[PDB]
């Protein structure tokens, strides 16, 4: 398919690796009882192994010569061959939660600078104000692009600068 990679459900080293992990787990399994808790834990392990290999073969991942899933990081090639779930949807999910954390921290900083003890509200966290901003932070991309377009996202050149500049 992409880059000479076969799909994992078509790959043979993928099936060999699945069979090898089952072989190691059953060689460890064959030295216990039946209803014993080590045997129960190893059968749960084998169930999770089979479920994991079936889910990775179901998700349409691409395997190499080693039988291991390879990820495709190109928006157009991923959206063309059905691989947006591995890099593209995770990167927009990450950027949503990372801007969430950063915007809630920025709103807490701006809220606590407007008092007579900003360092005291930085050492001892104002929990109601922090939870208020943490719930209100869900509209952070809209609020961020609005603060961008008003010219209030950015401080002017009243910043601290060195002698050189």
């Amino acid at each position: 398919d992409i880059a000479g990679l076969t799909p994992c459900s078509e790959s043979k080293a993928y099936a060999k690796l699945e069979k090898k992990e089952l072989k190691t787990l059953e060689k460890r399994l064959k030295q216990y009882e039946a209803d014993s808790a080590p045997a129960v834990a190893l059968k749960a392990t084998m169930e999770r192994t089979k479920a994991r290999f079936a889910n990775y073969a179901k998700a349409g991942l691409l395997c190499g010569n080693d039988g291991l899933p390879h990820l495709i990081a190109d928006p157009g090639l991923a959206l063309k061959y059905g691989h947006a779930g591995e890099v593209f949807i995770p990167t927009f999910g990450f950027l949503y939660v990372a801007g969430y954390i950063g915007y809630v921290g920025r709103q807490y900083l701006i809220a606590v600078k407007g008092e007579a003890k900003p360092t005291d509200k930085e050492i001892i966290i104002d929990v109601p104000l922090a939870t208020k901003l943490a719930w209100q932070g869900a509209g952070w991309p809209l609020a961020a692009v609005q603060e961008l377009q008003r010219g209030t996202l950015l401080e002017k050149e009243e910043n601290i600068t060195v002698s050189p500049r």
Binding site: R48, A59, G85, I89, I124, I125
Partner: protein
């Protein structure tokens, strides 16, 4: 009790509680959704 809540509002206690919540949330998600790599 007010002073005990101020002590619980201090920085390392909130870092401990919040990282316990975040780590437990990720642990719970990895238990009920075992081994996620995509989507």
């Amino acid at each position: 009790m007010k002073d005990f809540t101020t002590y619980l509002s201090t920085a390392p206690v909130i870092a401990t509680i919040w990282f316990t919540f975040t780590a437990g949330l990720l642990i719970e998600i990895n238990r009920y959704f075992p081994d996620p790599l995509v989507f």
